[PDB]
Amino acid sequence: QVKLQESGAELVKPGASVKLSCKASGYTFTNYWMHWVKLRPGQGFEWIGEINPSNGGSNYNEKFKRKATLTVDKSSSTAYMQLSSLTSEDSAVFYCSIWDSYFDYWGQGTTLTVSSAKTTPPSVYPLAPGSAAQTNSMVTLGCLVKGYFPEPVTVTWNSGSLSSGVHTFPAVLQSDLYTLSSSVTVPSSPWPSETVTCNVAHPASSTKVDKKIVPR
Amino acid sequence: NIVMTQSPKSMSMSVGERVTLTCKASENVVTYVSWYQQKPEQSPKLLIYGASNRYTGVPDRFTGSGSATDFTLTISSVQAEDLADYHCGQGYSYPYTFGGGTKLEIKRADAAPTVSIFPPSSEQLTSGGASVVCFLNNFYPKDINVKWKIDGSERQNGVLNSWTDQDSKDSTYSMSSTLTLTKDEYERHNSYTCEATHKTSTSPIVKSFNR
């Protein structure tokens, strides 16, 4: 498969620098320019620059001149962007992508948080009604993912299996800490005669948590 | 630097209708304009290149047009899946630049929220904390109000609300409201109440547990 793999998240102290990676596979790495773009919530895209993996040839957005530097490693087939002298203005999602008219593709983007604040694993609390048979034909279960920093966390149910009827709500910052919740809706034929288990990962703290939803 | 501007800022159209998104460039960019579609919790996808060339795979209902300084994305018959932020960018001159995006939403039939309430877990209660959570799911339109009651009395401090983006399948919205208290305020009350106000009902939808 054509893939451009970027790290999910990066937390970095302000004033420091960071090396964003974009690891390519599924195509001939050296035949396509790599574009780096910046995306902040409610803003449009900002183009940082582009680099030719064949020779390292580069073109930058003057605006990012003193801020970003593009490199490539042909043997790892990996593009890198270094960001220096980080400030809060830098916190954003960063993407690498190929812009060909016959071949347009985007990494998942890395969420950059620049903050002096230390990383705090989430607490995760199962949400059961609980009891039984209430109400309609299905049941709504959920998980409360609370008190963490920085974004993001990823929430799945039954390790991806349960993708039907999931709602994961946007994290909200309440006092230098994020909280989000997620709900799943399943027929009462499954639950609770099956495992229903929410899976939560917090990249920044390398936290992994499974919480089975138990009745009552 | 070339500045791109889109219109409208946001809109909602009914499934089946024709939708028109515009994009103005501060100077001539010939036809070097692309349109990107960015659906919720997803990376952007190329819809149109060279102002009018459908990227391989793109459904026919998406047609790009325009030249010079004025460009248009037309969706001949919107489908619920077309919910998204649409972006246009020029690739004529460095640095490459993008407009501020147009947020397209889908209009659907009014729909009442499924309301469901949850008491704090024993896990949390042991830590000193107590969050009570209420899911108001799959309603429309987006406008909704939640009210918390403790033994009959509205509670105001300590509540946090979050709304999902519109859903690509059924065009509805969902919301989460969490009331957070201390363990020993929570135990010191019996009745906990989630009260939803929506245009689908003249009376609020109440959900409640005791204990």
Author numbering:
A (entry chain A): 0 to 215
B (entry chain B): 1 to 211
What's the paper's own text on this?
The minimal epitope of the G196 mAb is the five amino acid sequence DLVPR. A Kd value of ~10 nM or less between the anti-tag mAb and the tag is desirable for rapid and robust purification of modest to low abundance proteins of interest, and such levels are common when the proteins are expressed at the endogenous level. It is noteworthy that the Kd between mAb G196 and the G196-tag peptide is 1.25 nM, which is comparable to or higher than the affinity of the anti-FLAG M2 mAb/FLAG-tag interaction (Kd = 3–28 nM, and typically considered high affinity). Furthermore, mAb G196 recognized G196- and GFP-tagged Atf1, as shown by immunofluorescent staining of yeast, comparable to that of a polyclonal anti-GFP antibody.
The structure of G196 Fab was determined as the antigen-free form at 2.0 Å resolution using the molecular replacement method. The R and Rfree values of the final model of G196 Fab were 0.191 and 0.228, respectively. Although the structure of G196 Fab shown in this study does not contain the epitope peptide, it nonetheless shows remarkable features of the antigen binding site. Tyr32 and Trp33 in CDR-H1, and Trp99 and Phe103 in CDR-H3, together form a hydrophobic core. Asn31 in CDR-H1, and Asn52 and Asn55 in CDR-H2, are located at the side of the hydrophobic core and are good candidates for recognizing Asp. Leu at position 2 and Val at position 3 of the G196 epitope might be recognized in the region. Therefore, it is likely that Arg at position 5 is recognized by Tyr102 in CDR-H3 rather than by Asp104. Structural analysis of G196 complexed with the epitope peptide will allow precise elucidation of this antibody’s high affinity recognition mechanism for the epitope.
